[PDB]
Amino acid sequence: KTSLSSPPWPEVVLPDPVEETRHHAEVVKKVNEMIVTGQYGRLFAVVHFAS
Amino acid sequence: VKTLLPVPSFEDVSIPEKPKLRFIERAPLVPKVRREPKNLSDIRGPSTEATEFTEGNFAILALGGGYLHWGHFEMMRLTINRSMDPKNMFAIWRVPAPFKPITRKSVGHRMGGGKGAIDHYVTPVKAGRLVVEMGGRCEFEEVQGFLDQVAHKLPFAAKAVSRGTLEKMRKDQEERERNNQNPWTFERIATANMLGIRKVLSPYDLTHKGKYWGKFYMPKRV
């Protein structure tokens, strides 16, 4: 171990794709249920119009 | 038991009758009347004459172009004739005597009024030419001392060489060109006129290949 033995940034371990695919489905279902049940107030949107 | 080694024998070498360097005259035998242009391309680019050894084994290599006047020849002659052993050494001239006339106008005169009068003569020299060649019953370390001293006083970049060092110098340059890891070279770009680069180059750059700039030679350029 030295000041230059390893990079300065911390090591990042990304989630398992199989496990994350299941977590993603849960998040999407939760947000979809909020839409069905109307758990939102004022909305905003970014629209492309006239270039 | 310090291991001794054989020594080269120079018994087979012959010494001329006038080993010392002959005298060079300021101007040629018959004075010239026709005035000449500068013709500065006589010191520009690689040399195509007096690039190889003829009789001796050691010489002074020119690493740049320039003009030699009488003052230079006297410095070379006296310095060499004094430092050399006439019995075991000999020297010869590899450059002709000053022949190119150099005109010059009188002090205080304005531009115009024709051309100046012949003042002195010079010998044009190109890069890669041998100026003085030595040889005889001597090693390189012996002549290299006073030969480098002379090379430093010349108007161009010079250096003492030998049949071996000169050969190695040339083979080392070829090795650099072969193992060069840069995929872009001056030759490839210039000859193909890539990027329209020939708009800032010279027609001579097709043959010099970036190793020459005016009278200066760059050995580190591949």
Partner: protein, 43 residues
């Protein structure tokens, strides 16, 4: 102090211009395009 004689970018004595890293990369980028142009003009 540090004057350049006459005008900066002309004449005998000039302000020295140096080649930056990105100036080099710019040239190499266009050398690669032209090298490929050579290839497609060969057939």
């Amino acid at each position: 102090r540090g004057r350049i004689p006459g005008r900066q970018w002309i004449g005998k004595h000039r302000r020295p211009r140096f080649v930056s890293l990105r100036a080099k990369q710019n040239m190499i980028r266009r050398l690669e395009i032209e090298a490929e142009n050579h290839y497609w003009l060969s057939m």
